[model samples]
Target: RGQVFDVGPRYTNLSYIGEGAYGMVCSAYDNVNKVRVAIKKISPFEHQTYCQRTLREIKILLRFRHENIIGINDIIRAPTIEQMKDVYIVQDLMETDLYKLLKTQHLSNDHICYFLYQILRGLKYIHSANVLHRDLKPSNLLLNTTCDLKICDFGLARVADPDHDHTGFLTEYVATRWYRAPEIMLNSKGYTKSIDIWSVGCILAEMLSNRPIFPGKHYLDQLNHILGILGSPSQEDLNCIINLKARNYLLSLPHKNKVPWNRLFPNADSKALDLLDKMLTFNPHKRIEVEQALAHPYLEQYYDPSDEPIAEAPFKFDMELDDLPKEKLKELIFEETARFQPGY
Candidate 1:
């Protein structure tokens, strides 16, 4: 029960933030306090299980506090519905998501590094707190007033009790397809924090190229893409993650189909390129860790974003998102969602 504001000075529903399995997001202003916030309204339902699940997610979100992490400012339980199952989440709103920004523009090497660093910082905090975001992608990361990474959308998140690794209690459906780690696809057990490392790596490479690095049109095609770039199962990969089963599946998949590493990032420094390759390594265990990735020579380079993070994006975006009417923005979101059934 954070501050509740009915309406006042700064109340304005800016636009959609991003779509998800549970609900849609829109930027709104708190009229009572004159502050910008995000209002997330879950779909109407009558199931008590869903309500309890929503409460569990809310509690999980409220337990963390970090600069790079998204802060949960408030919760609107039973949000004035005719039923007990209706709910909404009121959070401190951020500007826009990385995917929307990426769709509109390109960036310098320094810009990419800044955003990546902030993402790593956020993930590190989650791991330290024994929480797994389960669903992390450019879209779920909110950009706050400072444009720092604020991880959002915890409806699917849960506490990762490492001891439960003996039995598969968690869902493998965690994380986006493009950013999924090797071990998860491999269906390995007793997975560690390094799984997040793999995702960070895939995303890092995607960041370098500014498009989906592993844009497999279908699951079969995706496996081919993964195997081709990382190479068919190496001994290191098999030895690293315990009880991995995708080794046999690797034999059937195709080999080396990616653009040569040098061609992928023509002007990037060797260290940066090296860091990206290691992150996307075929072997999950051998892949770089969050701490190691942060310390790589790639991050040692310029653009001290901690001092000054944002730059004017190298493109134009007048999609009625930041400066349009609420009904119009909602229309755009509804229109676009049909194209990308980004599911739960």
Candidate 2:
């Protein structure tokens, strides 16, 4: 229903929602449907990167069709021009992202359960379609008053066959570091649907706790944090990635330990924590699937959105100096890389 008569200048009356690596999400009134929607448009070419991921998002969004999955209602394409970027992917406006709510600290238990349920449901559909949402983070999970999670941003998603395996290009990072699955952390080849599920577990833990479970400074640091909390991975974890750089380095580095989930997330339900452990397991084969996770006794207690109001979660940490608006985001990305955290 949200259609634009003309691509150019149709969204001129829009307001800023936020900025991303690919483009800026702006709030606009859908002239055709007469409803407000979030219009995602690419930034200026010089400043904007991620051409492949942005195009990947549009491709995946066009094929998705699930109640819990976020809908991609339209794609406004402009005729190729000498010096301009075109907008694409018109979607329903979301009140905020899960990361943003994690900041307020008002997210109720009911809200956490409800949003996780929808996220799993949507992931189930995507998995059934043989699509992997390679990138699943709090920012990718949008919510409203109902807290019915709408999984957004398929920029890193890819389609893989159920019968055959697909190799992932290590050129760019897929999921966010902390939420990244162990197999992915090792840069495992022929990845599966479980990658996204791991991200879900990371987010769920954040919702249950008031903070980021693992706040890693760098990629290797994240691996170390993950290895510390979840125990060291096996040589098999090392074997999974054929192209592992300096594979022998892991030999001297300690591995072969297993960290229990209950210990990592103290005060959490055993059953809930158990399921998350399986998802966050160091072994890829041991990881839980969307269907299996959906059936878990922990997740079995999910509630419906219509039943009650879901409190908004807050963004507890990582409000970096660079995490600003479009203009400011650009300014920080290039002009102001200096951060102000004082000291340890």
Candidate 3:
């Protein structure tokens, strides 16, 4: 509903869905299959980051199979290099993303419970598989009418690199400004999958309030927004920041205690506020982990191990498909398809 785009020849009856720097996406009826699917048209060669993000997304989707994660229908290829202007990725169609849904809508407690549970369920699977969905925001969260939610868009997801040094910023880019984690804001030495939990907390709070709790114009502004409400980080939290400069800068800020969750989400129930408190904890180590959050009192009734099982990390795939010639790219993609081993 946001951006106008074409879905190419194989898919007919194209309808615009949305547009972003990565590519233009649209809903189209697959003439050959006689069904509709969402298609993402991407130009990997346009930028190195585009190439990497496109390849990473495809690679992740190839093996990911979960109710709360988007399903990939098929990948349509162009016949030749000159013709390979855009790579078409066909995925399961959905009514809308959380970004569109959150606007002009009042969510009920049951709706929030179900919706948040699905997100946590999906994220637990992702983290279990050793994936860090660096871009976790309402926009990337897809949804349908039944309150079903799916985690999509893993372009910025990093396969957990345990050995990497974390003395400085791990990556210059991260989640959207509103949901950015404190560790990321202070440029802490290293972060964990818990960064995703922080995002989940922000999302939960936003859902309860019907708007973003911390809407910051910039990085520092975001930090100030957090400090003003959540209060300053504890000394132990500051110790997590390996950089002396970053540590000192954080310590220099005026002291404040943790704000009451009830005040933050005035209507939030005891259970919901309890979970929010833990999830919003400033310390990455202290933030509620996905599994722990799932088991919390707030989600006790919805907890089902069968619905949220641990996932094994798949073999990391990284090849410069964008750098390859058209035929070569097709061959590699085909090979990847052949190599895909779906789990039960």
Candidate 4:
């Protein structure tokens, strides 16, 4: 069981961390900074989509710098443009992810509240930049023993127009089925940043119950799990569903009554449940916005309006508008990586 990391000499003490669908990760000590960092090596050349996602993640991370958002320290410079096949991203080495913590430790109400607060706080910043973190899950949230939580993994993220419906471009495989919003699963033509809010709600429920809130066997079953709790959608709510087949299928199913939050989370604080209710609303229009969620009583102890800063301007990546080939995408990614180099 031997693995090799060719991320260059600037980083040493390389130790295997873990692997995901897209890349292999290793913990490396940054020789320059004298700090430990996570080095993610991904081969974007494998697919056009992978190349685009790599470029998108690199650009977004470079643009976004916040306490609750993972920071990209640097990108290892490839030896030559022609030989560039793997992209190595350097980021803060978090102690562990939320998925591990949730399974290993018993969290208190205070822990839940603070964690949720930071999520919304960071989300507010992300939304303010008109970016939708299409994939938000426990595994994507990194945490330290000090209780600091950071949102990571931006490969599925997209920039959205504030005043327009951008769901038409969304792919079916955007987020984990369990955390996916109803609007997304229903193939609704128009959805907003509230989609991310729905994910936050699922994560909160999982934390409270010590299990997945909507673990389903497939896409249809996932919808069933959500409907089982939220009940049948109203006719008005059904109007937002663009996929006629899905809407009809929803109508054909037996009507369900909404379940009380207390039943599922009997021991959860009333304020927390109240906030969860607002967040997990069936209709995207009725769901709590990131800013409002931050103001909810559940997070009152940590809420500070002045401290919740929004992005100075909406994030604009002209490259996203184009369907560039792998070669062009690699060139752009290399250009971005060069920004962190000493003589760039």
Q: Whole-model lDDT, candidate 3?
A: 0.75
| Off by more than 4 A, model 4 | 162-171, 189-191, 240-243, 317-322
**Alpha-carbon RMSD, each predicted model:** 11.9, 12.0, 4.1, 2.3
Model 2, C-alpha of 72: deviation from truth (Å)? 1.7
Residue-wise C-alpha lDDT for candidate 1, range 165-212, written one tens digit per residue: 432212254357777665555554323566677667767776677788
lDDT per residue as tens, model 3, 35-84: 88898877665565566666677778777888898877777655444555
By lDDT, highest first, what's the ranking?
4, 3, 2, 1
Cα deviation at 208, candidate 3, in Å, is: 0.7
Identify the candidate with maximal TM-score. 4
RMSD of 2: 12.0
> Per-prediction count of colliding residue pairs?
0, 8, 2, 0
Residue ranges of candidate 2 with Cα displaced over 4 Å: 1-13, 44-49, 79-84, 161-174, 234-248, 255-260, 302-344
lDDT of each: 0.59, 0.63, 0.75, 0.84
- Quickly count the clashes in candidate 4: 0
lDDT top scorer: 4
- Model 3 Cα RMSD, 1 decimal: 4.1
After superposing candidate 3, which stretches have Cα over 4 Å from the reference?
Answer: 1-10, 169-171, 189-191, 316-344
State the lDDT at 37 in candidate 3.
Answer: 83
- Count clashing pairs, candidate 2: 8
What shift in Å separates residue 235 of candidate 3 from its native position after superposition? Answer: 2.5
